[PDB]
């Protein structure tokens, strides 16, 4: 799942995911769309000419000028067209737009046909479509079937089926606020409330457990030393405030490695960040070791591999 507001956008996810995931793994990543605007198709499609993804993605959008049955029938194109590539040798990866077309068309069409259904303005076909459609994107022997769960909740409605179906049908849900992108960073996805169940617990390894425990404890324990201590003063700043503020600011401002989105749009490189540099560098050098990297030279670095030479060469 996905949450948050703006910051990243469709150009960062489509441009960064249309080159790194396409070359790092064999498979065709398609997309969809139900309930969009009539003018966005005349602008967002231009982004396909800035990243070369139109030849590797099937844009199946219905806009919103039609009714419910003519625009909400995009489920057969994704499931019928995505099964030919995932069951042959490649890995399909669809991308949804929102849940207003399926929820409004399903609840209004299923509840306005002269039959009773669910309560709170909902329909009784939400468990069959959400449970049957949410469990269909699973791994197989001929290829993994991935799908970007981009469902939109009804303004955090816990009594309706958006929080229960979206929070109980999906897996991890990353949130992107305006604080990570308002300062001038690359990745807008914050590290708080953006992890799965097998990413911070004891069901992975020492790299994910030490990096998740050290980054989560260092970020949560260091986020209050720069925000709550600013109202009083910096006179009581010992080794925890300087080490936690320098390691949290340098690690948080230097951990956002640039992908292939700005390589054919803006001009910045970075290639792709590896798991050995981010998992074996953010748990030791980002706590209290090698304090030679600043804030300007550490930016635009690929994980912790490019940040080692920037402290002595820049």
């Amino acid at each position: 799942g996905l949450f948050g507001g703006a910051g990243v956008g469709k150009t960062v996810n489509m441009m960064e995911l249309i080159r790194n995931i396409a070359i790092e793994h064999s498979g065709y990543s398609v997309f969809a769309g139900v309930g969009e605007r009539t003018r966005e198709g005349n602008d967002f499609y231009h982004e396909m000419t800035d990243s070369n993804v139109i030849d590797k993605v099937s844009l199946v959008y219905g806009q919103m000028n039609e009714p419910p049955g003519n625009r909400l029938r995009v489920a057969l194109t994704g499931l019928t067209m995505a099964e030919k590539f995932r069951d042959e040798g490649r890995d399909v990866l669809l991308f949804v737009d929102n849940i207003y077309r399926y929820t409004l068309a399903g609840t209004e069409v299923s509840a306005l046909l002269g039959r009773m259904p669910s309560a709170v303005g909902y329909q009784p076909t939400l468990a069959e479509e959400m449970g049957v459609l949410q469990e269909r994107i699973t791994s197989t022997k001929t290829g993994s079937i991935t799908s970007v769960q981009a469902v939109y909740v009804p303004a955090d409605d816990l009594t309706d089926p958006s929080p229960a179906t979206t929070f109980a049908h999906l897996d991890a849900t990353v949130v992107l606020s305006r604080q990570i992108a308002s300062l001038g960073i690359y990745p807008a996805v914050d590290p708080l409330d953006s992890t799965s169940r097998q990413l911070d617990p004891l069901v992975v390894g020492q790299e994910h457990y030490d990096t998740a425990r050290g980054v989560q404890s260092i970020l949560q324990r260091y986020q209050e030393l720069k925000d709550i201590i600013a109202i009083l003063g910096m006179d009581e700043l010992s080794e925890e405030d300087k080490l936690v503020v320098a390691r949290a600011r340098k690690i948080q401002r230097f951990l956002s490695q640039p992908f292939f989105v700005a390589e054919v749009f803006t001009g910045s490189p970075g290639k792709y960040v590896s798991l050995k540099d981010t998992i074996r560098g953010f748990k030791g050098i980002m706590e209290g070791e090698y304090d030679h990297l600043p804030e300007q030279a550490f930016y635009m670095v690929g994980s912790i591999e490019e940040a080692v030479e920037k402290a002595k060469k820049l």
């Binding site: 309560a119 709170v120 303005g121 955090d156 816990l158 009594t159």
Partner: protein, 284 residues
């Protein structure tokens, strides 16, 4: 977004949080600027104590009028000042230290002679119990030795004549920025200023005075400089305690009521029940 009680509770919680944040920020800035710009009165106490004690070994060694003070027949006391709102722990330490020190120090066979000072002295001594000899009114955050003549003038006849020998200057002290420790040292008796009285005067030991000028002018300068200089801990501790308590309690106390607004997120679900009646009327 509200629902009758949620609208008034959200508006009152927002107005109380904004007023508590503005009053806590203004009280914190005024307390930090006034305390940092006025917490350096030690020229009269250091100059009078060091100059009187450093030269009193060759002049005040024969006769000293500040030794016996008054006769052992009563027990003096004091009260802390609290002219601002929400003093913090000044009422508990003032009544507990004044009632415990006055009751324990006067229960053996002494009397009571407390000295009220500030807004808290008129209600913590005259409206509670003990003794009310004099109450200095009209102090504020700018205390001086000109307006504080009621303490030395009203206490000069009971400490240097024969009434209360030992006393207890209970006052709300502050040794840091958020540590309001009320001290109750024994005053109106013997200062014992022996900072440099171990040696004699190496220069000319001659002046135009005697024991009355060296024992009378030093008590007003040391007592007025210590009592007048030590009064900044009451206003700084009360304003700092009210600003820190209002800023820290404004995000955990009344702001906690905002958590009840989360329950209002479920109240909208009750509106769905309003549609159920339509099944018995509209939908039939």
């Amino acid at each position: 977004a509200g629902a009758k009680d949620i609208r008034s509770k959200i508006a009152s919680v927002q107005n109380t949080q904004k007023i508590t944040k503005a009053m806590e920020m203004v009280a914190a800035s005024k307390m930090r600027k006034s305390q940092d710009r006025m917490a350096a009165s030690r020229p009269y106490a250091e100059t009078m104590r060091k100059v009187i004690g450093h030269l009193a070994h060759g002049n005040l060694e024969y006769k000293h009028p500040y030794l016996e003070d008054r006769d052992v027949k009563r027990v003096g006391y004091l009260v802390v000042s609290t002219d601002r709102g929400l003093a913090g722990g000044l009422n508990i330490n003032l009544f507990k230290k004044l009632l415990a020190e006055m009751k324990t120090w006067t229960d053996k066979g002494v009397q009571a002679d407390l000295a009220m000072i500030g807004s808290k002295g008129v209600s913590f001594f005259n409206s509670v119990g003990g003794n009310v000899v004099a109450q200095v009114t009209g102090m504020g955050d700018n205390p001086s030795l000109s307006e504080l003549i009621g303490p030395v003038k009203v206490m000069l006849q009971a400490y240097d004549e024969g009434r209360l020998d030992k006393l207890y200057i209970v006052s709300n002290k502050f040794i840091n920025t958020m540590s309001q420790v009320p001290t109750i040292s024994q005053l109106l008796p013997l200062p014992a200023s022996d900072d440099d009285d171990l040696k004699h005067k190496s220069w000319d030991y001659l002046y135009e005075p005697d024991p009355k000028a060296l024992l009378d002018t030093l008590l007003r300068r040391y007592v007025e400089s210590q009592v007048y200089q030590g009064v900044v801990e009451n206003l700084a501790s009360e304003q700092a305690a009210r600003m820190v308590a209002m800023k820290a309690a404004t995000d955990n106390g009344g702001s906690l009521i905002k958590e009840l607004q989360l329950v209002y997120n479920k109240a909208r679900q009750a509106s769905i029940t309003q549609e159920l009646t339509e099944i018995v009327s509209g939908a039939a």
